[PDB]
Design a protein around this ligand. Sequence first.
Ligand SMILES: CC(=O)n1cc(C(=O)Nc2cc(CO[C@H]3CCCCO3)cc(C(=O)O)c2)c2ccccc21
Ligand SMILES: CC(=O)n1cc(C(=O)Nc2cc(CO[C@H]3CCCCO3)cc(C(=O)O)c2)c2ccccc21
Lengths: 113, 113
Amino acid sequence: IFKPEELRQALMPTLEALYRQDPESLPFRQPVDPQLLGIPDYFDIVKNPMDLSTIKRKLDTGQYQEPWQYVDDVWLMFNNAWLYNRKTSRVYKFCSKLAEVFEQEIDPVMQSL
Amino acid sequence: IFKPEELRQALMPTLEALYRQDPESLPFRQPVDPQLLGIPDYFDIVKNPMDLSTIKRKLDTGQYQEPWQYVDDVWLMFNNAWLYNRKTSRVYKFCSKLAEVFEQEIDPVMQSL
Ligand SMILES: CC(=O)n1cc(C(=O)Nc2cc(CO[C@H]3CCCCO3)cc(C(=O)O)c2)c2ccccc21
Ligand SMILES: CC(=O)n1cc(C(=O)Nc2cc(CO[C@H]3CCCCO3)cc(C(=O)O)c2)c2ccccc21
């Protein structure tokens, strides 16, 4: 039993704190476009894309029933980037920065719920 | 014989240093849109518009043959902004800061190649 308008109250500050990271969030504010980014093999590796805009729209439009689905999506987005990208690349490091932030934002919110 | 991914690795640090200027890079991260910004004389004054998202695209999709073409697109972006906006304007002052930064990051990079 979980309602998605309280989930907005509860979880959106955590999402907002990822968007707040600048410039680290910018490669995550939109879906990965493999041709435009010059990474045509992206979907030979990643099979479930995720990004901040998809996560925000799902919060905004009730596609999250429980809060662990939001959490798993946020980790899917980061995992994808750690899976595809080189460890020395800026996008990898940006991923690790957002992940750090996300871990500290999300714990008290989830310990509450 | 500069290969696309060689230019991308060498030059993209300088593009990151531009994005890291907040708020100064904010008006430069997407193409100037006259309707949305209410400036219908923009294209009567600026003929070769340039912005960070275009420059990034060209680097991502190997559209630069040599480093001086990138350096040219960055300066074109600055010169358009100084040309169009009044000296007292936020956009002009922001531009000035982005150029002082770029000058400091482009130096070791061009020598290095
Ligand atoms: C999510 C993901 O894995 N990626 C995301 C990439 C990427 O550059 N995304 C990106 C990055 C940016 C701007 O990010 C800046 C951040 C500072 C470094 C210069 O780029 C804008 C957009 C967009 O408006 O569509 C997209 C990317 C590039 C190469 C390999 C992987 C990439
Ligand atoms: C590059 C250029 O010449 N311009 C860039 C202008 C501009 O404000 N672009 C802009 C600027 C911003 C960010 O605006 C910031 C500016 C500083 C902090 C307050 O918000 C976002 C967008 C967008 O959402 O597309 C666009 C602009 C406005 C008037 C005249 C010229 C302008």
